[PDB]
Design an enzyme around this catalytic site. Structure first.
Site, PDB file in Angstrom:
ATOM      1  CE  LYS A 105      -4.373   0.625   0.063  1.00  0.00           C
ATOM      2  NZ  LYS A 105      -5.538  -0.158  -0.615  1.00  0.00           N
ATOM      3  CG  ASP A 145      -7.086   3.322  -1.910  1.00  0.00           C
ATOM      4  OD1 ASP A 145      -7.403   2.223  -2.035  1.00  0.00           O
ATOM      5  OD2 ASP A 145      -7.113   4.100  -1.039  1.00  0.00           O
TER       6      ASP A 145
HETATM    7  N1  LIG Z   1      -9.838   2.909  -5.703  1.00  0.00           N
HETATM    8  C1  LIG Z   1     -10.195   1.690  -6.255  1.00  0.00           C
HETATM    9  O1  LIG Z   1     -10.071   1.801  -7.341  1.00  0.00           O
HETATM   10  C2  LIG Z   1     -10.601   0.783  -5.323  1.00  0.00           C
HETATM   11  C3  LIG Z   1     -10.876   1.095  -3.911  1.00  0.00           C
HETATM   12  N2  LIG Z   1     -10.801   0.000  -3.105  1.00  0.00           N
HETATM   13  C4  LIG Z   1     -11.259   0.443  -1.618  1.00  0.00           C
HETATM   14  O2  LIG Z   1     -12.391   1.189  -1.297  1.00  0.00           O
HETATM   15  C5  LIG Z   1     -12.753   2.360  -0.681  1.00  0.00           C
HETATM   16  C6  LIG Z   1     -13.211   3.418  -1.554  1.00  0.00           C
HETATM   17  O3  LIG Z   1     -12.626   3.627  -2.748  1.00  0.00           O
HETATM   18  P1  LIG Z   1     -13.201   4.533  -3.909  1.00  0.00           P
HETATM   19  O4  LIG Z   1     -14.693   4.086  -4.331  1.00  0.00           O
HETATM   20  O5  LIG Z   1     -12.157   4.460  -5.086  1.00  0.00           O
HETATM   21  O6  LIG Z   1     -13.356   6.085  -3.197  1.00  0.00           O
HETATM   22  P2  LIG Z   1     -13.179   7.215  -4.244  1.00  0.00           P
HETATM   23  O7  LIG Z   1     -11.762   7.616  -4.359  1.00  0.00           O
HETATM   24  O8  LIG Z   1     -13.832   6.773  -5.579  1.00  0.00           O
HETATM   25  O9  LIG Z   1     -13.944   8.438  -3.900  1.00  0.00           O
HETATM   26  C7  LIG Z   1     -14.251   8.589  -2.560  1.00  0.00           C
HETATM   27  C8  LIG Z   1     -15.734   8.567  -2.231  1.00  0.00           C
HETATM   28  O10 LIG Z   1     -16.271   8.141  -1.067  1.00  0.00           O
HETATM   29  C9  LIG Z   1     -16.501   9.289  -0.372  1.00  0.00           C
HETATM   30  N3  LIG Z   1     -16.114   9.057   0.947  1.00  0.00           N
HETATM   31  C10 LIG Z   1     -14.809   9.179   1.593  1.00  0.00           C
HETATM   32  N4  LIG Z   1     -14.855   9.141   2.883  1.00  0.00           N
HETATM   33  C11 LIG Z   1     -16.390   8.852   3.207  1.00  0.00           C
HETATM   34  C12 LIG Z   1     -16.875   9.024   4.379  1.00  0.00           C
HETATM   35  N5  LIG Z   1     -16.281   9.048   5.580  1.00  0.00           N
HETATM   36  N6  LIG Z   1     -18.226   9.125   4.432  1.00  0.00           N
HETATM   37  C13 LIG Z   1     -19.075   9.044   3.407  1.00  0.00           C
HETATM   38  N7  LIG Z   1     -18.381   9.093   2.117  1.00  0.00           N
HETATM   39  C14 LIG Z   1     -17.013   9.248   2.029  1.00  0.00           C
HETATM   40  C15 LIG Z   1     -16.070  10.231  -1.091  1.00  0.00           C
HETATM   41  O11 LIG Z   1     -16.991  11.592  -0.879  1.00  0.00           O
HETATM   42  P3  LIG Z   1     -16.755  12.846  -1.649  1.00  0.00           P
HETATM   43  O12 LIG Z   1     -16.952  12.563  -3.196  1.00  0.00           O
HETATM   44  O13 LIG Z   1     -17.655  13.757  -1.281  1.00  0.00           O
HETATM   45  O14 LIG Z   1     -15.548  13.525  -1.490  1.00  0.00           O
HETATM   46  C16 LIG Z   1     -16.498   9.823  -2.359  1.00  0.00           C
HETATM   47  O15 LIG Z   1     -17.477   9.990  -2.642  1.00  0.00           O
HETATM   48  C17 LIG Z   1     -11.517   2.451  -0.210  1.00  0.00           C
HETATM   49  O16 LIG Z   1     -11.286   2.323   0.990  1.00  0.00           O
HETATM   50  C18 LIG Z   1     -10.709   1.664  -1.192  1.00  0.00           C
HETATM   51  O17 LIG Z   1      -9.411   1.327  -0.512  1.00  0.00           O
HETATM   52  C19 LIG Z   1     -10.799  -1.194  -3.328  1.00  0.00           C
HETATM   53  C20 LIG Z   1     -11.481  -1.405  -4.764  1.00  0.00           C
HETATM   54  C21 LIG Z   1     -10.423  -0.837  -5.814  1.00  0.00           C
HETATM   55  O1  LIG Z   2      -5.935  -2.823  -7.838  1.00  0.00           O
HETATM   56  C1  LIG Z   2      -4.879  -2.571  -6.859  1.00  0.00           C
HETATM   57  O2  LIG Z   2      -3.539  -3.096  -7.207  1.00  0.00           O
HETATM   58  C2  LIG Z   2      -4.838  -1.991  -5.553  1.00  0.00           C
HETATM   59  C3  LIG Z   2      -6.554  -2.095  -5.243  1.00  0.00           C
HETATM   60  C4  LIG Z   2      -6.730  -1.420  -3.790  1.00  0.00           C
HETATM   61  O3  LIG Z   2      -6.160  -0.572  -3.346  1.00  0.00           O
HETATM   62  C5  LIG Z   2      -7.373  -2.313  -2.738  1.00  0.00           C
HETATM   63  O4  LIG Z   2      -8.047  -3.343  -3.048  1.00  0.00           O
HETATM   64  O5  LIG Z   2      -7.537  -1.753  -1.512  1.00  0.00           O
HETATM   65  O1  LIG Z   3     -10.924   8.523  -7.383  1.00  0.00           O
HETATM   66  C1  LIG Z   3     -11.626   9.086  -8.134  1.00  0.00           C
HETATM   67  O2  LIG Z   3     -12.166   8.762  -9.072  1.00  0.00           O
HETATM   68  C2  LIG Z   3     -10.978  10.508  -8.179  1.00  0.00           C
HETATM   69  C3  LIG Z   3     -10.466  11.039  -6.788  1.00  0.00           C
HETATM   70  C4  LIG Z   3     -10.789  12.529  -6.557  1.00  0.00           C
HETATM   71  O3  LIG Z   3     -12.130  12.905  -6.751  1.00  0.00           O
HETATM   72  C5  LIG Z   3      -9.721  13.407  -5.991  1.00  0.00           C
HETATM   73  O4  LIG Z   3      -8.397  13.015  -6.357  1.00  0.00           O
HETATM   74  O5  LIG Z   3     -10.190  14.664  -5.432  1.00  0.00           O
END
Ligand SMILES: NC(=O)C1=CN([C@@H]2O[C@H](COP(=O)(O)OP(=O)(O)OC[C@H]3O[C@@H](n4cnc5c(N)ncnc54)[C@H](OP(=O)(O)O)[C@@H]3O)[C@@H](O)[C@H]2O)C=CC1
Ligand SMILES: O=C(O)CCC(=O)C(=O)O
Ligand SMILES: O=C(O)CCC(=O)C(=O)O
Ligand SMILES: [N+]
Length: 419
Positions: A105, A145
């Protein structure tokens, strides 16, 4: 704002689950400590000409099974403990779906909403310049992420290729890239597709027809929005409530994910969406739904709301959204939980597919990626399910038994631990 320390929680889960398996003490001590942690200073030049230094982390917890894999999180509330916990979870995540990866990570303590495009690019390039010595296509493969996107991934890949002088497969140093610069088809909806497959398999196991049922999704990012869209499209579900950091919208009649996304893009948040009622994340987690998918910050279900959850299936799309205590409460309530590092393993699986395509120089189609992902997710989910059924244990624990054992075997095949 986290209830309990993330790394401490992760170690507690690891011990709690190793209580149901035969593992040596030395192996447990090895697995309870990240194998390498790199804390770096990331200096960038701001738009006004001043130089600002941020704090970056690259934590690899174990590479017995192969090169470590894990995304990069950009977050003001981030701490080294959070990155350590995420790398530890990454290890089990890649072990459960049987990938030749270890756990890794990365992160930067930064508020990306306060940074411009040029500042974000400078930050990504400086982070790569700082952590180049510990990353590589066969050493450590970052990925998108929270608050990071394929744009930043492409910037990081370009910087790594510039430093690496194009000696090897630079495209494979990082995943979640744009399709033009070595991207993979289906990577955009990867974690959502894996979560949908796991939800379908869980419903199959529980004997529940998902058509016409209700799903509530927390977080509207890359995972939450695509999970809601795919649940409405593929599973025939009715999305009744969504949310982001500023709050959520609930509608008994159902929401169209595309219109909600357009409103969020045109207003900055899903709040005050027409035809919907504004609620809080705490209220959304307590809604009467059939599936609840937390896709946001970790530790959202604790002893402060564990007994108030009313969903038949909780799909932990997020990384570690439920505490072990809350896990015990939910299991006592008869609620099936898809473990965090099994539900959202589709993202890391398609990242592995992209890495394979990059290192081989040959790229696949949408159908091949979709079929391989479905096959892998179904196999992993059924392994974990039968594991928890045979031993009469919690889901989370069973996945650990599936995951850690594999990792354990790797050490015994490397001579790291004799016992
Ligand atoms: N990034 C990825 O490709 C993937 C991510 N994961 C895991 O999943 C989780 C989410 O990733 P991801 O969907 O990409 O997030 P994103 O980077 O796409 O965006 C974050 C979203 O979640 C919201 N958010 C962050 N904190 C809170 C909170 N405390 N309460 C409510 N909404 C919140 C943000 O709100 P706002 O838009 O208003 O800022 C935004 O809508 C992470 O923990 C990540 O590690 C694993 C699968 C792949
Ligand atoms: O796809 C990856 O290699 C990273 C995915 C990730 O950040 C997660 O599963 O929490
Ligand atoms: O995770 C994404 O799709 C974009 C992240 C984002 O909104 C930011 O970097 O401010
Ligand atoms: N993932």
């Amino acid at each position: 704002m986290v209830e309990i320390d993330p790394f401490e929680m992760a170690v507690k889960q690891l011990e709690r689950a190793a209580q149901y398996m035969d593992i040596s003490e030395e192996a447990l001590e090895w697995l309870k400590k990240p194998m390498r942690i790199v804390e770096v200073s990331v200096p960038i030049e701001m738009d006004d000409g001043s130089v600002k230094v941020f704090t970056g982390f690259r934590v690899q917890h174990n590479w017995a099974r192969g090169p470590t894999k894990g995304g990069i999180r950009w977050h003001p509330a981030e701490t080294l403990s959070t990155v350590k916990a995420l790398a530890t979870w990454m290890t089990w995540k890649v072990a459960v779906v049987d990938l030749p990866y270890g756990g890794g990570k990365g992160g930067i303590i930064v508020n990306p909403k306060e940074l411009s495009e040029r500042e974000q690019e400078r930050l990504a390039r400086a982070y790569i310049r700082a952590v180049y010595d510990v990353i590589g296509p066969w050493t450590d493969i970052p990925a998108p992420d929270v608050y990071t996107n394929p744009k930043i991934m492409g910037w990081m890949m370009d910087e790594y290729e510039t430093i690496m002088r194009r000696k090897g497969p630079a495209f494979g140093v990082i995943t979640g890239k744009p399709l033009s610069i070595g991207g993979s088809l289906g990577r955009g909806t990867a974690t959502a597709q894996g979560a949908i497959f796991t939800i379908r398999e869980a419903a199959k196991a529980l004997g529940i027809d998902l058509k016409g049922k209700k799903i509530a999704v927390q977080g509207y990012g890359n995972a939450g929005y695509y999970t809601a869209k795919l649940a409405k499209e593929q599973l025939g579900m009715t999305v009744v409530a969504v949310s982001d950091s500023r709050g959520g919208i609930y509608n008994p009649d159902g929401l169209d994910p595309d219109e909600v996304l357009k409103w969020k893009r045109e207003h900055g948040s899903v709040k005050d969406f027409p035809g919907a009622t504004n609620i809080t994340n705490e209220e959304l987690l307590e809604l009467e739904v059939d599936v609840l998918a937390p896709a946001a910050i970790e530790e959202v279900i604790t002893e402060k709301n564990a007994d108030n959850i009313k969903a038949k299936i909780v799909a932990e799309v997020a990384n570690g959204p439920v505490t072990p205590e809350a896990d015990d409460i939910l299991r006592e309530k008869g609620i099936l939980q898809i473990p965090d590092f099994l539900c959202n393993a589709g993202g890391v699986t398609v990242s592995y597919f992209e890495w394979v395509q990059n290192i081989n120089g040959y790229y696949w189609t949408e159908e091949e990626v979709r079929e391989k992902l479905d096959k892998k997710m179904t196999k992993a989910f059924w392994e974990v399910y039968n594991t928890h059924k045979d031993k009469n244990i919690h889901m989370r624990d069973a996945a650990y038994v599936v995951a850690v054992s594999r990792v354990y075997q790797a050490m015994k095949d490397r001579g790291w631990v004799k016992k």
